[PDB]
Structure 1
Amino acid sequence: LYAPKDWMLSKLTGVFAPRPRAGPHKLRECLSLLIIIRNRLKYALNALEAQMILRQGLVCVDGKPRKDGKYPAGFMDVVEIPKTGDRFRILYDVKGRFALVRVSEAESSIKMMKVVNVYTGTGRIPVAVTHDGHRIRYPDPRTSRGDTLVYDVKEKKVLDLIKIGNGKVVMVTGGANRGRIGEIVSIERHPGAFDIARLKDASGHEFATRATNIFVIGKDMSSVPVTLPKQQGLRINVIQEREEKLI
């Protein structure tokens, strides 16, 4: 199996699913495309229709319209499917779960990506590498891992990186608090445990998960003009939900 559970696959069949590919947005924190073609948009339903997508290539992704279904989609990717011209972004809703989240074409005309690493390049060149598959030459002179960065997507253009710290609007992307959202309350250095992360959610209920899983997304709610998952990540009283449900 090794099914990846937040890909919401199920029951019978899919020993493997169609396995993803080596190529940015790592195995476990991907949400690769195929699943989308068949299992998300739904028109294409068989493998036959997928197959059909491909033998008539079709499917299209910002940046490269992308050829690979096995290619991970993950945080913020922008799909346009020109037959109907429909766009979605990749993003969690609360209760941790990933949606393909339809987004404005114009909103669907940028994205944000965390820096995973910040390097020299050969010649007082610097180059930064993002936690999702960018290497970018000559970035801010002092950018750093864990600061995210706005990208044009339509173009090759950084629109930002934001001189990070404490108290900044965060989407918690994993550990326990996957799909939790919370402005950073703070991170204490916890060196080599990594900083651990005090988070407070839209309630103003505060919660912790380790600093690694923390996607700054802005200040003042969204700095980003990106989609905000309904509820915006507290996690609460199921019970009531049940209740709520039953009208």
Structure 2
Amino acid sequence: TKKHLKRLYAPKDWMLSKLTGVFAPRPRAGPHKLRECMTLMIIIRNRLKYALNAAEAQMILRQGLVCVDGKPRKDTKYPVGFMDVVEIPRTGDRFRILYDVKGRFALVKVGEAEGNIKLLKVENVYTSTGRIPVAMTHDGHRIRYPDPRTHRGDTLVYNLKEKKVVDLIKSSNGKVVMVTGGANRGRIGEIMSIERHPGAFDIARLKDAAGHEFATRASNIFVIGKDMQSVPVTLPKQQGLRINVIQEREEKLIAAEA
């Protein structure tokens, strides 16, 4: 049992300093893990800057003014992972968090339609009392599951005010993917060949726009859509392309003139 987290045992992706206290908030058990997530008070304070310090944060949160997934959240700390939607009425802002190139969390801004749309992977599929089929994901169960039954590793489309499930998408060649984990995340690609190694980690081989193809595992893959015109959701300014270190550097120089 551990109730304390510290600044040097916390991820780099939150971008907290070495200095300025020796403690960081430990998010609770929730829809997502401790080693990837962004906790509430970290978002509000250190990003959107509607809080300057700890007291400020809870003086927002505890009044029910912040809502991930349509449910108001009183708690100071509570994790928010990949592919969630944060809606704070008072401003008129809406976020859909995501990863972006350089492996680091990013924030999109979305309108009406996509403030009710989400996506969910499938981790496992199992059977419960009365022969009722069940799925399990990151965030939550939810029950049965047609849209038409099928299989693990596939990706659904979930609506949050009520279920209207548009279809789903599967893991098959020529489709499109965004990545998590593995120091390869914040990219986007196609799906070429998937190697299967029994009893052992399963290795995928991918591609992306204008070549520079690559590879990862298969539990770091999260499907997005059939094609890159077929996407249900919006994406950052970068389209999941890494470009070379030298290219980047050079460009930053040339444009700095102002």
TM-score, normalising length: structure 1: 0.91
**One-letter amino acid of the counterpart of residue 135, structure 1:** H
Question: Where does 1:34-183 land on structure 2 (aligned, <5 Å)?
Answer: 34-130=41-137, 132-140=138-146, 142-183=149-190
- Residue-by-residue CA offset, 1:14-50 (whole Å, 9 max, x unaligned): 5342111101111112222221111121121211211
Listed as ranges, the gaps of 5+ residues in structure 1 are: none
CA contact (8 A) 1:33 1:69 kept: yes
SS of corresponding position for 1:176: coil
- CA distance 1:194–1:222, change in 2 (3 Å): farther
Pairing partner for 1:9 from 12, 16, 31: 16
Q: What is aligned with 2:3?
A: none
Listed as ranges, the gaps of 5+ residues in structure 2 are: 1-5
What is the aligned residue count? 246
SS of corresponding position for 2:192: strand
SS of corresponding position for 1:136: coil
Q: What is aligned with 1:237?
A: 244
* Alpha-carbon offset, residue 235 of structure 1: 1.7
- CA distance 1:58–1:162, change in 2 (3 Å): same
- CA distance 1:233–1:125, change in 2 (3 Å): same
Larger Rg: 2
Q: RMSD across aligned C-alpha pairs, in angstroms?
A: 1.9
* Alpha-carbon offset, residue 151 of structure 1: 0.5
Question: Where does 1:200-219 land on structure 2 (aligned, <5 Å)?
Answer: 200-219=207-226
Instruction: Write the distance in 2 (CA, Å) between the matches of 1:67 and 1:149.
Output: 29
Instruction: Write the distance in 2 (CA, Å) between the matches of 1:104 and 1:14.
Output: 38
Instruction: Write the distance in 2 (CA, Å) between the matches of 1:159 and 1:67.
Output: 31
* Alpha-carbon offset, residue 76 of structure 1: 1.8
- CA distance 1:176–1:146, change in 2 (3 Å): same
Instruction: Write the distance in 2 (CA, Å) between the matches of 1:15 and 1:122.
Output: 49
- CA distance 1:185–1:45, change in 2 (3 Å): farther
- Residue-by-residue CA offset, 1:163-200 (whole Å, 9 max, x unaligned): 33122100011202111211222321123332211121
SS of corresponding position for 1:25: coil
Instruction: Write the distance in 2 (CA, Å) between the matches of 1:191 and 1:185.
Output: 20
CA contact (8 A) 2:155 2:224 kept: yes
**One-letter amino acid of the counterpart of residue 120, structure 1:** T
Larger relative contact order (Cα-Cα within 8 Å, sequence gap ≥ 6): 1
- CA distance 1:143–1:45, change in 2 (3 Å): farther
Instruction: Write the distance in 1 (CA, Å) between the matches of 2:69 and 2:45.
Output: 19
- Residue-by-residue CA offset, 1:119-141 (whole Å, 9 max, x unaligned): 112112001001x2221211026
Instruction: State which drifts further: 69-78 or 107-116.
Output: 69-78
TM-score, normalising length: structure 2: 0.88
- CA distance 1:143–1:39, change in 2 (3 Å): farther
Instruction: Write the distance in 1 (CA, Å) between the matches of 2:158 and 2:76.
Output: 23
Instruction: Write the distance in 2 (CA, Å) between the matches of 1:123 and 1:51.
Output: 44
- CA distance 1:217–1:91, change in 2 (3 Å): same
CA contact (8 A) 1:143 1:161 kept: no
Moved over 4 A (4+): none
- CA distance 1:55–1:114, change in 2 (3 Å): closer
- CA distance 1:209–1:80, change in 2 (3 Å): same
SS of corresponding position for 1:244: helix
SS of corresponding position for 1:197: strand
